[PDB]
Design an enzyme around this catalytic site. Structure first.
Site, PDB file in Angstrom:
ATOM      1  N   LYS A  51      15.665  -8.787  -6.566  1.00  0.00           N
ATOM      2  CA  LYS A  51      14.281  -9.215  -6.757  1.00  0.00           C
ATOM      3  C   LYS A  51      13.352  -8.014  -6.897  1.00  0.00           C
ATOM      4  CE  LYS A  51      13.376  -9.696  -1.782  1.00  0.00           C
ATOM      5  NZ  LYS A  51      13.821 -10.622  -0.704  1.00  0.00           N
ATOM      6  N   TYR A 276     -13.509  12.689  -5.700  1.00  0.00           N
ATOM      7  CA  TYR A 276     -14.558  11.711  -5.442  1.00  0.00           C
ATOM      8  C   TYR A 276     -14.939  11.744  -3.977  1.00  0.00           C
ATOM      9  CZ  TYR A 276     -14.063   9.374  -9.984  1.00  0.00           C
ATOM     10  OH  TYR A 276     -14.059   9.036 -11.325  1.00  0.00           O
TER      11      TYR A 276
END
Ligand SMILES: *Cc1c(COP(=O)(O)O)cnc(C)c1O
Ligand SMILES: *Cc1c(COP(=O)(O)O)cnc(C)c1O
Lengths: 386, 386
Positions: A51, A276
């Site tokens: 999965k 930032y």
């Protein structure tokens, strides 16, 4: 989940012009499978759980190994994953490891998936699909003895037992398995819940006139298969350990490395802000490496001012917050650094290694949260060496 | 970043058999662009920033809007993104918004990207590419007046100024722009750094004999373009605001919703554990909805026991931790719930709305950390209504 898993297996030139990428050690995968096999009882079979596009490592690149190793069963979650597995030529048992909507199940009929049901309505819906397609569909009944309270039918009440019998006696379905799943890596708890599962599954088989010798009883994930061997039963469902992510069992090394390269080298004087929010300021004249990887590639914002990366066999600090697309690293004291040099974000380089625990602590995530999204967000290169 | 951005625009049937998906409001995107345009000076032009596959919203599905709106410039980060932009038929200016390795830049020559350089070595490398391809390559020089300390050349020292002049006078390159980028949404700081940028760029143009009227000066991201209008200069570089993610400016609503559906409904008695690590136990007889979405789809583990989802116009609590592929929700008191019903993980449904701040607080991430990985991990459906 991705609607389609890309059919390409990236080559070296393609990787060379990618910003960041995953390196998957096929040798380590093969080794992990063989090691795992060595601990399985003779009467248990293996269902490799693939999965999330093989836990980020990529179904299409790993299926030839699964086939060469003669693994009889594969588990998937999405339809795209089921398609990728069948497109490999795999003709063994294909199970779904989760509840899937009717719309998902109906679209996947051609793929011969054995669905996983824990409610009457799922049984009814699949029975109708069976009727309309003129066949008998094979199913696994999920029970709640493990206490996940997710996919299974809880049988601790009369109403739950009655619903379980309804599921198990549905016309047009063939019950090929009965299963549960455990929520913790606590061996004593797993043993107690295993006993309860044996009681519940025996009762259910009696009630629905199922023949034990035709039913595959399966309860074990990676942890359970290795650490509670008596829970191996008829089939085990290892996912993480095959890929080297079973935290209790470090003897299965991770098969994944996450890499980028130095794009550019920048001279920045003392007392200069980086990134930032200006969360870092140089304390000295610096040389900073600009890496074209950021949080949109799955390298989290939180890595900034916490993590180290490996460049030219040495650890270098990530400075400032990571942006959407860029990461900045302090290479002031790293000798030999040049544009184009490979950078390891997770993995090994020369004598250095970034630990899983280190990754987790810095990202404030568990390891599979990282690698599953690395896998949807970066190409995989399958390294075959040693 | 993805090596290839899938060419398919998922249709309704494909979405119907997907586990989870993003819904992108094309009308809201168009509206946001038109609103943004209304605030731009007559002498500034727009470069729509479409990095990270258009901020998770998808370059291929959004480019026809960019073209219809007559936007003259697009910015991207990866080569796959540059390809997707050119494959839309867009023939305007295409800029790279980040430092890119030589290997990236050399492989993208056919795409006519204007690269972004902040070091002598980048200038030298591109000049050599220009020489070998028999052309003059167009470039933007990144300056560090904003104080990002990332992609630009810092000019606060003699050595930095000397390097800047070397970049700007490189043979075989045409300097078409000079830019910087700001690290904070503080208008006073942006104004001070803007003044410094004007000084630095003027000096550089004088030193390298560049003609002001042929150079595009550009410094403004979304925040700056709207909130410091005098920084619009020759061109603005809006990304987030177009997609409705400029936190200072809520008048641009988000264009993205994240959805799944109820797979199955499970009756679980009082005092039953849910999920890995058994972090939740029912306090009453319950009905739980099993959703086939988990952290490998970009719905974080931390959402469990914190977040609410919307089902049939009502809020329902996520119980237990989210697994790799599954999320469990308590619908005990929600009236009308049925398998197959749509679930909103982020967005609006009837009179309910999940706020960005709510998402951030629950995930312990900033919004773009979520949506960029939603975009690599789920199909996008482009809703065109109203
Ligand atoms: C993923 C999963 C497994 C495999 O779990 P691991 O801990 O990775 O081995 C087994 N069974 C089910 C139902 C699963 O969802
Ligand atoms: C992403 C980016 C932008 C756009 O930023 P927003 O805050 O999303 O508007 C502009 N310029 C550069 C250099 C960027 O990297």
């Amino acid at each position: 989940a991705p609607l389609h898993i890309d059919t390409a297996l990236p080559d070296a030139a393609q990787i060379q012009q990618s910003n960041s990428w995953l390196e998957i050690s096929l040798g380590q995968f093969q080794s992990n499978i063989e090691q795992f096999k060595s601990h399985m009882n003779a009467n248990t079979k293996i269902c490799a759980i693939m999965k999330a596009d093989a836990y980020g490592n990529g179904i299409r690149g790993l299926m030839p190994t699964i086939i060469a190793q003669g693994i009889p069963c594969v588990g998937v979650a999405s339809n795209a994953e089921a398609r990728a597995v069948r497109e490999s030529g795999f003709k063994g048992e294909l199970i779904r490891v989760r509840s899937a909507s009717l719309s998902e199940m109906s679209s996947a009929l051609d793929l011969n998936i054995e669905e996983l049901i824990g409610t009457h309505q799922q049984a009814l819906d699949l029975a109708e699909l069976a009727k309309q397609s003129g066949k008998t569909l094979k199913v696994h009944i999920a029970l709640n003895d493990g206490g996940m309270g997710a996919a299974g039918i809880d049988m601790t009440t009369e109403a739950g037992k009655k619903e379980a019998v309804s599921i198990a006696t549905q016309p047009s379905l063939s019950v090929v398995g009965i299963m549960t799943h455990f929520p913790n890596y606590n061996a004593d708890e797993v043993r107690a819940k295993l006993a309860q599962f044996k009681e519940s599954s025996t009762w259910l088989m009696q009630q629905a006139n199922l023949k034990r010798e035709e039913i595959t009883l399966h309860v074990a994930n990676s942890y359970t298969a290795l650490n509670v061997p008596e829970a191996q039963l008829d089939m085990v469902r290892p996912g993480g350990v095959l890929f080297g992510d079973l935290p209790t069992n470090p003897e299965y090394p991770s098969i994944v490395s996450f890499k980028t390269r130095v794009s550019s080298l920048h001279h920045l004087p003392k007392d200069s802000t980086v990134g930032y929010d200006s969360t870092f300021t140089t304390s000295r004249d610096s040389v900073l490496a600009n890496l074209p990887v950021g949080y949109s590639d799955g390298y989290p914002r939180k890595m900034g001012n916490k993590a180290e990366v490996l460049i030219n066999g040495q650890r270098a600090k990530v400075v400032g917050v990571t942006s959407m697309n860029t990461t900045v690293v302090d290479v002031t004291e790293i000798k030999g650094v040049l544009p184009g040099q490979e950078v390891v974000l997770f993995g090994q380089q020369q004598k250095q290694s970034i630990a899983v625990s280190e990754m987790e602590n810095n990202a404030e995530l568990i390891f599979p949260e990282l690698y599953t999204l690395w896998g949807t967000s970066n190409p995989r290169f399958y390294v075959k060496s040693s």
